Amino acid sequence: KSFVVSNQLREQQGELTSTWDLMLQTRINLSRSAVRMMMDSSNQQSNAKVELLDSARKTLAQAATHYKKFKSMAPLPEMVATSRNIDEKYKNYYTALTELIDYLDYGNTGAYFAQPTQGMQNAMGERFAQYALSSEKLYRDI
Amino acid sequence: KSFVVSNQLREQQGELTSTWDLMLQTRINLSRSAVRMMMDSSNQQSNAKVELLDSARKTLAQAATHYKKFKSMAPLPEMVATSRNIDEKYKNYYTALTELIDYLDYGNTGAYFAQPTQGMQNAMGERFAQYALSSEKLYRDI
């Protein structure tokens, strides 16, 4: 099986890297918007806060597109548990990120700061590292 | 050559994913610190601004460790140009990120906001996508 199966593994990793990366980029643009919503309107800097929130929204939608691609390539047997785990972490971090867009949609920075977002970022981050370790080891077995 | 060479390619991609990801995480923690340095001292939220700057510093040092690992696996002939390009983009974004740590080290948020960091983030991001496209196509040729 080795070509077809190991290429499947690389394509599942690429798509997951694209999902993780675009969620970190959503986190970044939500951050850049929240600081400008705190600084108010006099501040020359405050004025891009809606562009930034719009960029955040756009990269989350792109993370969700790559994730569905990732989910369409069925996990190989040994990959099933980390892939299940990734899905759990992914949904908690996607949701955190969605609620943050929802708050800034109406300028609620108080609720933005009150969400413990980093905890969820970190859990996905560790899931990602575990998926990547597990896929390297099947790839050097395939 | 196919096993040894295609494994080399996957290991160079993994290390580069680790570099890109840790630089995005440095960007995130610098962001979280800059907003708390803007909010001042009354603000319960302002008080983690030095922990956050310290986390940023730590993930940049980790991005630089994985990058040296990436650079130690010599680019295969067709990968030499994107690998050169990645190095250029990487150094401009590593430097941007370093100057941002340097500003927040003494609470200079004015200089933090004045740096056009995102432009450099974006150039590295496009380099990364181009490297990943080019490596997929050599990998399906190897």
PDB file of N, CA and C in Angstrom, chain B residues 19-115:
ATOM      1  N   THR B  19       8.404  26.303  12.873  1.00  0.00           N
ATOM      2  CA  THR B  19       8.895  27.672  12.849  1.00  0.00           C
ATOM      3  C   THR B  19       7.755  28.657  12.591  1.00  0.00           C
ATOM      4  N   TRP B  20       6.925  28.478  11.546  1.00  0.00           N
ATOM      5  CA  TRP B  20       5.849  29.391  11.203  1.00  0.00           C
ATOM      6  C   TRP B  20       4.885  29.473  12.391  1.00  0.00           C
ATOM      7  N   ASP B  21       4.407  28.337  12.868  1.00  0.00           N
ATOM      8  CA  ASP B  21       3.513  28.304  14.011  1.00  0.00           C
ATOM      9  C   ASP B  21       4.002  28.998  15.249  1.00  0.00           C
ATOM     10  N   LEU B  22       5.287  28.900  15.572  1.00  0.00           N
ATOM     11  CA  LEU B  22       5.759  29.509  16.796  1.00  0.00           C
ATOM     12  C   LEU B  22       5.936  30.986  16.595  1.00  0.00           C
ATOM     13  N   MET B  23       6.101  31.439  15.358  1.00  0.00           N
ATOM     14  CA  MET B  23       6.229  32.866  15.110  1.00  0.00           C
ATOM     15  C   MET B  23       4.820  33.430  15.197  1.00  0.00           C
ATOM     16  N   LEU B  24       3.780  32.768  14.690  1.00  0.00           N
ATOM     17  CA  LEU B  24       2.414  33.257  14.818  1.00  0.00           C
ATOM     18  C   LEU B  24       2.094  33.302  16.301  1.00  0.00           C
ATOM     19  N   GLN B  25       2.525  32.322  17.090  1.00  0.00           N
ATOM     20  CA  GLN B  25       2.263  32.380  18.526  1.00  0.00           C
ATOM     21  C   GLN B  25       2.974  33.498  19.256  1.00  0.00           C
ATOM     22  N   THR B  26       4.122  33.930  18.730  1.00  0.00           N
ATOM     23  CA  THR B  26       4.873  35.051  19.301  1.00  0.00           C
ATOM     24  C   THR B  26       4.047  36.279  18.981  1.00  0.00           C
ATOM     25  N   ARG B  27       3.548  36.406  17.742  1.00  0.00           N
ATOM     26  CA  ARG B  27       2.717  37.509  17.325  1.00  0.00           C
ATOM     27  C   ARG B  27       1.512  37.623  18.248  1.00  0.00           C
ATOM     28  N   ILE B  28       0.876  36.477  18.547  1.00  0.00           N
ATOM     29  CA  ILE B  28      -0.289  36.455  19.438  1.00  0.00           C
ATOM     30  C   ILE B  28       0.040  36.945  20.851  1.00  0.00           C
ATOM     31  N   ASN B  29       1.097  36.423  21.466  1.00  0.00           N
ATOM     32  CA  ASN B  29       1.409  36.837  22.809  1.00  0.00           C
ATOM     33  C   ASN B  29       1.931  38.258  22.865  1.00  0.00           C
ATOM     34  N   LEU B  30       2.655  38.779  21.869  1.00  0.00           N
ATOM     35  CA  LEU B  30       2.992  40.191  21.817  1.00  0.00           C
ATOM     36  C   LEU B  30       1.722  41.042  21.750  1.00  0.00           C
ATOM     37  N   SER B  31       0.732  40.656  20.959  1.00  0.00           N
ATOM     38  CA  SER B  31      -0.559  41.302  20.892  1.00  0.00           C
ATOM     39  C   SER B  31      -1.296  41.396  22.217  1.00  0.00           C
ATOM     40  N   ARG B  32      -1.349  40.272  22.952  1.00  0.00           N
ATOM     41  CA  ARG B  32      -2.018  40.177  24.247  1.00  0.00           C
ATOM     42  C   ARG B  32      -1.305  41.036  25.266  1.00  0.00           C
ATOM     43  N   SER B  33       0.018  41.135  25.219  1.00  0.00           N
ATOM     44  CA  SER B  33       0.761  42.022  26.088  1.00  0.00           C
ATOM     45  C   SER B  33       0.530  43.482  25.719  1.00  0.00           C
ATOM     46  N   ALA B  34       0.596  43.889  24.440  1.00  0.00           N
ATOM     47  CA  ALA B  34       0.439  45.272  24.034  1.00  0.00           C
ATOM     48  C   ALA B  34      -0.911  45.828  24.431  1.00  0.00           C
ATOM     49  N   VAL B  35      -1.987  45.063  24.298  1.00  0.00           N
ATOM     50  CA  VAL B  35      -3.269  45.564  24.735  1.00  0.00           C
ATOM     51  C   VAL B  35      -3.234  45.787  26.254  1.00  0.00           C
ATOM     52  N   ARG B  36      -2.679  44.896  27.081  1.00  0.00           N
ATOM     53  CA  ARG B  36      -2.613  45.129  28.509  1.00  0.00           C
ATOM     54  C   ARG B  36      -1.646  46.227  28.876  1.00  0.00           C
ATOM     55  N   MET B  37      -0.622  46.560  28.089  1.00  0.00           N
ATOM     56  CA  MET B  37       0.228  47.688  28.398  1.00  0.00           C
ATOM     57  C   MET B  37      -0.509  48.997  28.066  1.00  0.00           C
ATOM     58  N   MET B  38      -1.506  48.981  27.179  1.00  0.00           N
ATOM     59  CA  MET B  38      -2.307  50.135  26.830  1.00  0.00           C
ATOM     60  C   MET B  38      -3.292  50.387  27.965  1.00  0.00           C
ATOM     61  N   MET B  39      -4.024  49.351  28.396  1.00  0.00           N
ATOM     62  CA  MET B  39      -4.958  49.377  29.522  1.00  0.00           C
ATOM     63  C   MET B  39      -4.053  49.615  30.702  1.00  0.00           C
ATOM     64  N   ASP B  40      -4.178  50.609  31.563  1.00  0.00           N
ATOM     65  CA  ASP B  40      -3.182  50.559  32.599  1.00  0.00           C
ATOM     66  C   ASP B  40      -3.680  50.014  33.914  1.00  0.00           C
ATOM     67  N   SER B  41      -2.670  49.982  34.766  1.00  0.00           N
ATOM     68  CA  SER B  41      -2.559  49.336  36.061  1.00  0.00           C
ATOM     69  C   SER B  41      -3.781  49.089  36.963  1.00  0.00           C
ATOM     70  N   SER B  42      -4.816  49.926  36.875  1.00  0.00           N
ATOM     71  CA  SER B  42      -6.058  49.700  37.603  1.00  0.00           C
ATOM     72  C   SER B  42      -6.696  48.372  37.136  1.00  0.00           C
ATOM     73  N   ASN B  43      -6.675  48.271  35.810  1.00  0.00           N
ATOM     74  CA  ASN B  43      -7.270  47.199  35.074  1.00  0.00           C
ATOM     75  C   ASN B  43      -6.703  45.884  35.486  1.00  0.00           C
ATOM     76  N   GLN B  44      -7.572  45.058  36.033  1.00  0.00           N
ATOM     77  CA  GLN B  44      -7.229  43.710  36.468  1.00  0.00           C
ATOM     78  C   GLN B  44      -6.522  42.935  35.347  1.00  0.00           C
ATOM     79  N   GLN B  45      -7.013  43.209  34.143  1.00  0.00           N
ATOM     80  CA  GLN B  45      -6.521  42.599  32.939  1.00  0.00           C
ATOM     81  C   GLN B  45      -5.116  43.065  32.628  1.00  0.00           C
ATOM     82  N   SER B  46      -4.718  44.323  32.914  1.00  0.00           N
ATOM     83  CA  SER B  46      -3.405  44.842  32.543  1.00  0.00           C
ATOM     84  C   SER B  46      -2.235  44.048  33.132  1.00  0.00           C
ATOM     85  N   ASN B  47      -2.492  43.452  34.306  1.00  0.00           N
ATOM     86  CA  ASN B  47      -1.475  42.806  35.148  1.00  0.00           C
ATOM     87  C   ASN B  47      -0.695  41.559  34.693  1.00  0.00           C
ATOM     88  N   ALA B  48      -1.097  40.962  33.569  1.00  0.00           N
ATOM     89  CA  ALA B  48      -0.364  39.846  33.003  1.00  0.00           C
ATOM     90  C   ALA B  48       0.520  40.280  31.847  1.00  0.00           C
ATOM     91  N   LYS B  49       0.624  41.559  31.566  1.00  0.00           N
ATOM     92  CA  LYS B  49       1.392  42.053  30.468  1.00  0.00           C
ATOM     93  C   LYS B  49       2.839  41.639  30.486  1.00  0.00           C
ATOM     94  N   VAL B  50       3.487  41.305  31.609  1.00  0.00           N
ATOM     95  CA  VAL B  50       4.907  40.941  31.579  1.00  0.00           C
ATOM     96  C   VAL B  50       5.029  39.435  31.373  1.00  0.00           C
ATOM     97  N   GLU B  51       4.134  38.612  31.937  1.00  0.00           N
ATOM     98  CA  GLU B  51       4.081  37.175  31.661  1.00  0.00           C
ATOM     99  C   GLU B  51       3.937  36.899  30.168  1.00  0.00           C
ATOM    100  N   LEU B  52       2.965  37.537  29.552  1.00  0.00           N
ATOM    101  CA  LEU B  52       2.686  37.511  28.139  1.00  0.00           C
ATOM    102  C   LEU B  52       3.886  37.903  27.305  1.00  0.00           C
ATOM    103  N   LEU B  53       4.581  39.006  27.626  1.00  0.00           N
ATOM    104  CA  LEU B  53       5.781  39.374  26.897  1.00  0.00           C
ATOM    105  C   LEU B  53       6.834  38.310  27.083  1.00  0.00           C
ATOM    106  N   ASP B  54       6.940  37.723  28.264  1.00  0.00           N
ATOM    107  CA  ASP B  54       7.886  36.641  28.484  1.00  0.00           C
ATOM    108  C   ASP B  54       7.544  35.392  27.688  1.00  0.00           C
ATOM    109  N   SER B  55       6.259  35.012  27.551  1.00  0.00           N
ATOM    110  CA  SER B  55       5.851  33.899  26.705  1.00  0.00           C
ATOM    111  C   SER B  55       6.229  34.159  25.232  1.00  0.00           C
ATOM    112  N   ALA B  56       5.942  35.356  24.686  1.00  0.00           N
ATOM    113  CA  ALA B  56       6.335  35.783  23.366  1.00  0.00           C
ATOM    114  C   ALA B  56       7.828  35.530  23.130  1.00  0.00           C
ATOM    115  N   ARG B  57       8.687  35.996  24.035  1.00  0.00           N
ATOM    116  CA  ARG B  57      10.137  35.789  23.949  1.00  0.00           C
ATOM    117  C   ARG B  57      10.594  34.327  23.889  1.00  0.00           C
ATOM    118  N   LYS B  58       9.922  33.550  24.712  1.00  0.00           N
ATOM    119  CA  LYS B  58      10.168  32.148  24.744  1.00  0.00           C
ATOM    120  C   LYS B  58       9.730  31.515  23.432  1.00  0.00           C
ATOM    121  N   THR B  59       8.546  31.736  22.835  1.00  0.00           N
ATOM    122  CA  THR B  59       8.223  31.056  21.585  1.00  0.00           C
ATOM    123  C   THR B  59       9.050  31.550  20.397  1.00  0.00           C
ATOM    124  N   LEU B  60       9.632  32.758  20.392  1.00  0.00           N
ATOM    125  CA  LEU B  60      10.511  33.205  19.312  1.00  0.00           C
ATOM    126  C   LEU B  60      11.793  32.420  19.348  1.00  0.00           C
ATOM    127  N   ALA B  61      12.339  32.243  20.567  1.00  0.00           N
ATOM    128  CA  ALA B  61      13.530  31.430  20.762  1.00  0.00           C
ATOM    129  C   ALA B  61      13.237  29.994  20.286  1.00  0.00           C
ATOM    130  N   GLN B  62      12.063  29.420  20.584  1.00  0.00           N
ATOM    131  CA  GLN B  62      11.703  28.115  20.061  1.00  0.00           C
ATOM    132  C   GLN B  62      11.548  28.100  18.529  1.00  0.00           C
ATOM    133  N   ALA B  63      10.972  29.136  17.881  1.00  0.00           N
ATOM    134  CA  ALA B  63      10.894  29.242  16.434  1.00  0.00           C
ATOM    135  C   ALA B  63      12.305  29.254  15.903  1.00  0.00           C
ATOM    136  N   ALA B  64      13.232  30.009  16.478  1.00  0.00           N
ATOM    137  CA  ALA B  64      14.595  30.023  15.970  1.00  0.00           C
ATOM    138  C   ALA B  64      15.334  28.697  16.111  1.00  0.00           C
ATOM    139  N   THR B  65      14.969  27.857  17.077  1.00  0.00           N
ATOM    140  CA  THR B  65      15.589  26.557  17.238  1.00  0.00           C
ATOM    141  C   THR B  65      15.132  25.672  16.126  1.00  0.00           C
ATOM    142  N   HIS B  66      13.831  25.581  15.844  1.00  0.00           N
ATOM    143  CA  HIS B  66      13.327  24.741  14.760  1.00  0.00           C
ATOM    144  C   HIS B  66      13.819  25.232  13.414  1.00  0.00           C
ATOM    145  N   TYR B  67      13.948  26.551  13.228  1.00  0.00           N
ATOM    146  CA  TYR B  67      14.454  27.055  11.979  1.00  0.00           C
ATOM    147  C   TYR B  67      15.868  26.593  11.687  1.00  0.00           C
ATOM    148  N   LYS B  68      16.791  26.650  12.643  1.00  0.00           N
ATOM    149  CA  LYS B  68      18.134  26.111  12.457  1.00  0.00           C
ATOM    150  C   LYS B  68      18.118  24.606  12.108  1.00  0.00           C
ATOM    151  N   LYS B  69      17.230  23.823  12.705  1.00  0.00           N
ATOM    152  CA  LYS B  69      17.019  22.454  12.311  1.00  0.00           C
ATOM    153  C   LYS B  69      16.573  22.416  10.869  1.00  0.00           C
ATOM    154  N   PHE B  70      15.648  23.288  10.466  1.00  0.00           N
ATOM    155  CA  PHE B  70      15.185  23.293   9.097  1.00  0.00           C
ATOM    156  C   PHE B  70      16.366  23.594   8.212  1.00  0.00           C
ATOM    157  N   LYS B  71      17.173  24.584   8.559  1.00  0.00           N
ATOM    158  CA  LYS B  71      18.242  24.967   7.684  1.00  0.00           C
ATOM    159  C   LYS B  71      19.308  23.892   7.608  1.00  0.00           C
ATOM    160  N   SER B  72      19.427  23.002   8.594  1.00  0.00           N
ATOM    161  CA  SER B  72      20.446  21.970   8.553  1.00  0.00           C
ATOM    162  C   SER B  72      20.137  20.853   7.548  1.00  0.00           C
ATOM    163  N   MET B  73      18.880  20.638   7.147  1.00  0.00           N
ATOM    164  CA  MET B  73      18.555  19.629   6.156  1.00  0.00           C
ATOM    165  C   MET B  73      18.624  20.368   4.828  1.00  0.00           C
ATOM    166  N   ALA B  74      19.754  20.201   4.119  1.00  0.00           N
ATOM    167  CA  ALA B  74      19.994  20.799   2.797  1.00  0.00           C
ATOM    168  C   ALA B  74      18.836  20.622   1.800  1.00  0.00           C
ATOM    169  N   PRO B  75      18.381  21.701   1.144  1.00  0.00           N
ATOM    170  CA  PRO B  75      17.278  21.682   0.189  1.00  0.00           C
ATOM    171  C   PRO B  75      17.652  20.775  -0.940  1.00  0.00           C
ATOM    172  N   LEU B  76      16.717  19.985  -1.398  1.00  0.00           N
ATOM    173  CA  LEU B  76      16.949  19.162  -2.574  1.00  0.00           C
ATOM    174  C   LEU B  76      17.028  20.103  -3.784  1.00  0.00           C
ATOM    175  N   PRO B  77      17.568  19.785  -4.970  1.00  0.00           N
ATOM    176  CA  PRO B  77      17.862  20.791  -6.007  1.00  0.00           C
ATOM    177  C   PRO B  77      16.687  21.677  -6.407  1.00  0.00           C
ATOM    178  N   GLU B  78      15.520  21.068  -6.551  1.00  0.00           N
ATOM    179  CA  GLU B  78      14.379  21.855  -6.935  1.00  0.00           C
ATOM    180  C   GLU B  78      13.841  22.699  -5.805  1.00  0.00           C
ATOM    181  N   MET B  79      14.226  22.390  -4.568  1.00  0.00           N
ATOM    182  CA  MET B  79      13.741  23.143  -3.423  1.00  0.00           C
ATOM    183  C   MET B  79      14.620  24.320  -3.080  1.00  0.00           C
ATOM    184  N   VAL B  80      15.795  24.449  -3.674  1.00  0.00           N
ATOM    185  CA  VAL B  80      16.731  25.497  -3.329  1.00  0.00           C
ATOM    186  C   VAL B  80      16.169  26.914  -3.445  1.00  0.00           C
ATOM    187  N   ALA B  81      15.412  27.251  -4.484  1.00  0.00           N
ATOM    188  CA  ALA B  81      14.918  28.615  -4.633  1.00  0.00           C
ATOM    189  C   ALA B  81      13.851  28.950  -3.604  1.00  0.00           C
ATOM    190  N   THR B  82      12.797  28.141  -3.346  1.00  0.00           N
ATOM    191  CA  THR B  82      11.849  28.451  -2.301  1.00  0.00           C
ATOM    192  C   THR B  82      12.495  28.441  -0.934  1.00  0.00           C
ATOM    193  N   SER B  83      13.472  27.586  -0.687  1.00  0.00           N
ATOM    194  CA  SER B  83      14.139  27.558   0.577  1.00  0.00           C
ATOM    195  C   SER B  83      14.908  28.845   0.753  1.00  0.00           C
ATOM    196  N   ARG B  84      15.429  29.464  -0.300  1.00  0.00           N
ATOM    197  CA  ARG B  84      16.181  30.709  -0.190  1.00  0.00           C
ATOM    198  C   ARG B  84      15.226  31.865   0.093  1.00  0.00           C
ATOM    199  N   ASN B  85      14.079  31.705  -0.523  1.00  0.00           N
ATOM    200  CA  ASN B  85      13.074  32.712  -0.387  1.00  0.00           C
ATOM    201  C   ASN B  85      12.497  32.740   1.004  1.00  0.00           C
ATOM    202  N   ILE B  86      12.187  31.567   1.541  1.00  0.00           N
ATOM    203  CA  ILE B  86      11.734  31.353   2.922  1.00  0.00           C
ATOM    204  C   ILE B  86      12.725  32.005   3.894  1.00  0.00           C
ATOM    205  N   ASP B  87      14.017  31.892   3.632  1.00  0.00           N
ATOM    206  CA  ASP B  87      15.018  32.407   4.535  1.00  0.00           C
ATOM    207  C   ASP B  87      14.953  33.916   4.556  1.00  0.00           C
ATOM    208  N   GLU B  88      14.742  34.517   3.389  1.00  0.00           N
ATOM    209  CA  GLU B  88      14.616  35.949   3.317  1.00  0.00           C
ATOM    210  C   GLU B  88      13.400  36.454   4.093  1.00  0.00           C
ATOM    211  N   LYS B  89      12.258  35.826   3.862  1.00  0.00           N
ATOM    212  CA  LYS B  89      11.026  36.221   4.515  1.00  0.00           C
ATOM    213  C   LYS B  89      11.091  35.966   6.016  1.00  0.00           C
ATOM    214  N   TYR B  90      11.738  34.859   6.387  1.00  0.00           N
ATOM    215  CA  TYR B  90      11.850  34.438   7.759  1.00  0.00           C
ATOM    216  C   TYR B  90      12.675  35.504   8.444  1.00  0.00           C
ATOM    217  N   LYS B  91      13.835  35.894   7.927  1.00  0.00           N
ATOM    218  CA  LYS B  91      14.614  36.892   8.611  1.00  0.00           C
ATOM    219  C   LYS B  91      13.877  38.198   8.726  1.00  0.00           C
ATOM    220  N   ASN B  92      13.035  38.634   7.779  1.00  0.00           N
ATOM    221  CA  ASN B  92      12.364  39.912   7.967  1.00  0.00           C
ATOM    222  C   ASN B  92      11.307  39.826   9.011  1.00  0.00           C
ATOM    223  N   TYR B  93      10.555  38.721   9.061  1.00  0.00           N
ATOM    224  CA  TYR B  93       9.543  38.555  10.078  1.00  0.00           C
ATOM    225  C   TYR B  93      10.178  38.280  11.468  1.00  0.00           C
ATOM    226  N   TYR B  94      11.265  37.506  11.633  1.00  0.00           N
ATOM    227  CA  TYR B  94      11.943  37.273  12.904  1.00  0.00           C
ATOM    228  C   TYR B  94      12.415  38.606  13.471  1.00  0.00           C
ATOM    229  N   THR B  95      13.014  39.431  12.630  1.00  0.00           N
ATOM    230  CA  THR B  95      13.448  40.773  13.011  1.00  0.00           C
ATOM    231  C   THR B  95      12.290  41.667  13.435  1.00  0.00           C
ATOM    232  N   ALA B  96      11.195  41.715  12.689  1.00  0.00           N
ATOM    233  CA  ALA B  96      10.036  42.487  13.090  1.00  0.00           C
ATOM    234  C   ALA B  96       9.564  42.120  14.516  1.00  0.00           C
ATOM    235  N   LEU B  97       9.437  40.806  14.725  1.00  0.00           N
ATOM    236  CA  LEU B  97       9.026  40.176  15.963  1.00  0.00           C
ATOM    237  C   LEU B  97      10.044  40.497  17.069  1.00  0.00           C
ATOM    238  N   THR B  98      11.348  40.421  16.797  1.00  0.00           N
ATOM    239  CA  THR B  98      12.345  40.807  17.767  1.00  0.00           C
ATOM    240  C   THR B  98      12.203  42.283  18.154  1.00  0.00           C
ATOM    241  N   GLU B  99      12.027  43.227  17.216  1.00  0.00           N
ATOM    242  CA  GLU B  99      11.893  44.634  17.534  1.00  0.00           C
ATOM    243  C   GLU B  99      10.644  44.884  18.324  1.00  0.00           C
ATOM    244  N   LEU B 100       9.576  44.145  18.081  1.00  0.00           N
ATOM    245  CA  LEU B 100       8.389  44.312  18.900  1.00  0.00           C
ATOM    246  C   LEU B 100       8.614  43.928  20.374  1.00  0.00           C
ATOM    247  N   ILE B 101       9.414  42.876  20.695  1.00  0.00           N
ATOM    248  CA  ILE B 101       9.796  42.424  22.061  1.00  0.00           C
ATOM    249  C   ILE B 101      10.659  43.531  22.672  1.00  0.00           C
ATOM    250  N   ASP B 102      11.617  44.015  21.896  1.00  0.00           N
ATOM    251  CA  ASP B 102      12.399  45.142  22.302  1.00  0.00           C
ATOM    252  C   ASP B 102      11.625  46.368  22.675  1.00  0.00           C
ATOM    253  N   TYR B 103      10.536  46.702  21.993  1.00  0.00           N
ATOM    254  CA  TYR B 103       9.758  47.865  22.395  1.00  0.00           C
ATOM    255  C   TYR B 103       8.987  47.657  23.678  1.00  0.00           C
ATOM    256  N   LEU B 104       8.324  46.521  23.784  1.00  0.00           N
ATOM    257  CA  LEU B 104       7.479  46.240  24.929  1.00  0.00           C
ATOM    258  C   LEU B 104       8.304  45.982  26.193  1.00  0.00           C
ATOM    259  N   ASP B 105       9.592  45.681  26.007  1.00  0.00           N
ATOM    260  CA  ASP B 105      10.542  45.526  27.090  1.00  0.00           C
ATOM    261  C   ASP B 105      10.602  46.760  27.989  1.00  0.00           C
ATOM    262  N   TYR B 106      10.371  47.925  27.370  1.00  0.00           N
ATOM    263  CA  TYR B 106      10.306  49.181  28.085  1.00  0.00           C
ATOM    264  C   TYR B 106       8.972  49.903  27.853  1.00  0.00           C
ATOM    265  N   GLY B 107       7.909  49.126  27.607  1.00  0.00           N
ATOM    266  CA  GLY B 107       6.556  49.626  27.491  1.00  0.00           C
ATOM    267  C   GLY B 107       6.330  50.595  26.352  1.00  0.00           C
ATOM    268  N   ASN B 108       7.125  50.608  25.293  1.00  0.00           N
ATOM    269  CA  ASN B 108       6.908  51.516  24.184  1.00  0.00           C
ATOM    270  C   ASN B 108       5.907  50.957  23.165  1.00  0.00           C
ATOM    271  N   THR B 109       4.619  51.081  23.521  1.00  0.00           N
ATOM    272  CA  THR B 109       3.493  50.690  22.656  1.00  0.00           C
ATOM    273  C   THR B 109       3.339  51.581  21.431  1.00  0.00           C
ATOM    274  N   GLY B 110       3.716  52.861  21.522  1.00  0.00           N
ATOM    275  CA  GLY B 110       3.713  53.747  20.374  1.00  0.00           C
ATOM    276  C   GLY B 110       4.557  53.173  19.239  1.00  0.00           C
ATOM    277  N   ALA B 111       5.786  52.724  19.534  1.00  0.00           N
ATOM    278  CA  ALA B 111       6.659  52.136  18.530  1.00  0.00           C
ATOM    279  C   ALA B 111       6.177  50.770  18.065  1.00  0.00           C
ATOM    280  N   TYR B 112       5.558  49.990  18.960  1.00  0.00           N
ATOM    281  CA  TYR B 112       4.961  48.710  18.639  1.00  0.00           C
ATOM    282  C   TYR B 112       3.930  48.957  17.561  1.00  0.00           C
ATOM    283  N   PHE B 113       2.978  49.874  17.760  1.00  0.00           N
ATOM    284  CA  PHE B 113       1.936  50.104  16.768  1.00  0.00           C
ATOM    285  C   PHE B 113       2.400  50.719  15.461  1.00  0.00           C
ATOM    286  N   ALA B 114       3.451  51.515  15.551  1.00  0.00           N
ATOM    287  CA  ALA B 114       4.054  52.109  14.383  1.00  0.00           C
ATOM    288  C   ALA B 114       4.761  51.059  13.539  1.00  0.00           C
ATOM    289  N   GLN B 115       5.190  49.890  14.019  1.00  0.00           N
ATOM    290  CA  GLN B 115       5.838  48.948  13.127  1.00  0.00           C
ATOM    291  C   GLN B 115       4.757  48.293  12.244  1.00  0.00           C
TER     292      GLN B 115
END
